[PDB]
Design a protein around this ligand. Sequence first.
Ligand SMILES: CC(C)CCC[C@@H](C)[C@H]1CC[C@H]2[C@@H]3CC=C4C[C@@H](O)CC[C@]4(C)[C@H]3CC[C@]12C
Ligand SMILES: CC(C)CCC[C@@H](C)[C@H]1CC[C@H]2[C@@H]3CC=C4C[C@@H](O)CC[C@]4(C)[C@H]3CC[C@]12C
Ligand SMILES: CC(C)CCC[C@@H](C)[C@H]1CC[C@H]2[C@@H]3CC=C4C[C@@H](O)CC[C@]4(C)[C@H]3CC[C@]12C
Ligand SMILES: CC(C)CCC[C@@H](C)[C@H]1CC[C@H]2[C@@H]3CC=C4C[C@@H](O)CC[C@]4(C)[C@H]3CC[C@]12C
Ligand SMILES: CCCCCCCC/C=C\CCCCCCCC(=O)OC[C@H](O)CO
Ligand SMILES: CC(C)(C)CC(=O)Nc1c(F)cc(C(=O)Nc2nccs2)cc1F
Ligand SMILES: CCCCCCCC/C=C\CCCCCCCC(=O)O
Ligand SMILES: CCCCCCCC/C=C\CCCCCCCC(=O)O
Ligand SMILES: CCCCCCCC/C=C\CCCCCCCC(=O)O
Ligand code: NA
Length: 388
Amino acid sequence: GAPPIMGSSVYITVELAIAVLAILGNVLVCWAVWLNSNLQNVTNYFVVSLAAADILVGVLAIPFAITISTGFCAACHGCLFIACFVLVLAQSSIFSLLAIAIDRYIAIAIPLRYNGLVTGTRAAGIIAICWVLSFAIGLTPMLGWNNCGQPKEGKAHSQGCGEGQVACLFEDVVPMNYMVYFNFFACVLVPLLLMLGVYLRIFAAARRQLADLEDNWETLNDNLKVIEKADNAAQVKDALTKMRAAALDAQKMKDFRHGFDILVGQIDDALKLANEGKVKEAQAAAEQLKTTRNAYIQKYLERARSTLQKEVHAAKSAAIIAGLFALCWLPLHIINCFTFFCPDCSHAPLWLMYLAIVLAHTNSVVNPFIYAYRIREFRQTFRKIIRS
Ligand SMILES: CC(C)CCC[C@@H](C)[C@H]1CC[C@H]2[C@@H]3CC=C4C[C@@H](O)CC[C@]4(C)[C@H]3CC[C@]12C
Ligand SMILES: CC(C)CCC[C@@H](C)[C@H]1CC[C@H]2[C@@H]3CC=C4C[C@@H](O)CC[C@]4(C)[C@H]3CC[C@]12C
Ligand SMILES: CC(C)CCC[C@@H](C)[C@H]1CC[C@H]2[C@@H]3CC=C4C[C@@H](O)CC[C@]4(C)[C@H]3CC[C@]12C
Ligand SMILES: CC(C)CCC[C@@H](C)[C@H]1CC[C@H]2[C@@H]3CC=C4C[C@@H](O)CC[C@]4(C)[C@H]3CC[C@]12C
Ligand SMILES: CCCCCCCC/C=C\CCCCCCCC(=O)OC[C@H](O)CO
Ligand SMILES: CC(C)(C)CC(=O)Nc1c(F)cc(C(=O)Nc2nccs2)cc1F
Ligand SMILES: CCCCCCCC/C=C\CCCCCCCC(=O)O
Ligand SMILES: CCCCCCCC/C=C\CCCCCCCC(=O)O
Ligand SMILES: CCCCCCCC/C=C\CCCCCCCC(=O)O
Ligand code: NA
């Protein structure tokens, strides 16, 4: 058996490398939001809460994991605290990710009341509540659900520990039934699945809205053709009444309101002629609608489409971040499941525990990269911060 300081040297060096990069990248995220008012919105207050959690992974959770890798003698509840603290930060991350998903759902499903409903003041209070709940959930073992009543006395004596002390190792103090049923199933898997459901609803809502935009445009152009080849005033009137309802339905900024004003007025003009039995005059008046459509309506159509595509792009970036949290944390949770549910299976070997721990920690590095690669306003602010 090779000297343990050699393998732990590699593990510890990698942990420290991750801690440095987790602190630097997420400090940059927080600085960017602090400095750029275009980045100061409710979505990005949850982004900052998530960056703060990742900063604390570098400042506290990684030094704690390095300390625990030594198995040093410690009062059992002190060991328990440094072992559980990373769970607080993971839980807070989950609350932030779920809040971000819900925020984007509200923005796409009910844009007209988003600004009245989702305010910065309410967001700060939500963030404070979620941090309190993260402490309660992550430190729940400190309330008595722990293995400190059954210390491994042979291991403690072999290391020369003193009274009330244990060799400090995560699995000796944190119960695995808490880790699997309460932390993983209830507090991690369930929120991640709820997030998956929110994102499905976001993309379905976008796809449906971009469909309805295209439907109204098609109805407008189809009914223009119907009028042109109509044969009596009654047919002209039928198509015009559909167009009028569809115009108001698409009405639901000054040049925008002017263009629809023109449009509905021109439909009313032609409809009045059609009811008077003046087919040719009604058809000629309807042809004027094509001038309004080119100058105004199509511009509104293109801008509505472009706004929806930007909402889709923003939601995908947020979903990538949630998906990467899952990818990085799941191996460690799955290993706990094997330890717990398969007592006939040999425990995952030490090199694999190390690997799964640093994979989980690497998730605290990756978000600033996603923001830089996918969000212009962050990328340009990062550049100004780094340059200046
Ligand atoms: C505001 C921040 C920076 C302060 C951080 C304080 C941290 C480092 C403190 C808070 C409580 C402390 C623990 C409390 C009790 C014990 C039991 C002892 O047998 C070994 C040390 C150990 C495990 C301590 C390690 C350091 C510790 C985790
Ligand atoms: C911002 C400030 C107030 C942080 C407050 C955290 C304090 C109150 C908590 C955090 C961790 C706690 C320690 C965790 C574990 C142990 C080991 C146990 O054998 C005696 C108590 C002791 C030493 C606790 C004392 C209280 C403690 C230090
Ligand atoms: C989330 C995505 C990346 C899936 C990752 C799956 C990983 C975590 C899976 C795939 C194969 C699994 C291993 C397969 C067999 C064993 C041997 C057993 O005696 C201990 C657990 C152990 C070592 C498993 C640990 C978990 C494991 C490494
Ligand atoms: C997408 C979501 C649902 C991922 C969560 C799936 C998890 C909970 C699944 C993936 C593979 C599963 C493991 C596959 C094999 C075994 C070995 C068996 O002797 C006990 C159960 C155990 C250890 C399973 C426990 C549950 C498990 C870890
Ligand atoms: C800006 C600063 C922000 C705050 C920065 C916080 C840094 C915490 C660092 C390391 C935690 C190490 C955990 C404590 C290591 C314990 C070693 C020990 O206690 O030795 C006991 C042994 O039994 C002999 O008595
Ligand atoms: C590697 C050792 C065995 C030599 C020391 C040790 O016990 N290290 C350790 C640690 F510091 C943190 C965790 C941890 O965070 N596990 C989680 N599972 C799900 C969410 S967090 C697991 C660990 F094994
Ligand atoms: C542009 C560069 C950004 C800053 C770079 C900082 C580099 C820090 C990286 C790794 C720290 C490695 C220290 C290794 C000492 C551990 C010794 C041991 O295992 O006992
Ligand atoms: C920005 C400030 C961040 C804080 C710096 C702290 C980093 C130190 C890293 C690891 C601490 C390791 C704890 C030592 C274990 C003791 C081993 C033993 O006692 O047997
Ligand atoms: C440890 C398990 C979780 C604990 C469950 C119950 C603890 C807290 C419950 C609810 C917090 C709800 C916040 C409502 C505060 C009122 C704010 C307002 O004025 O509108
Ligand atoms: Na995180």
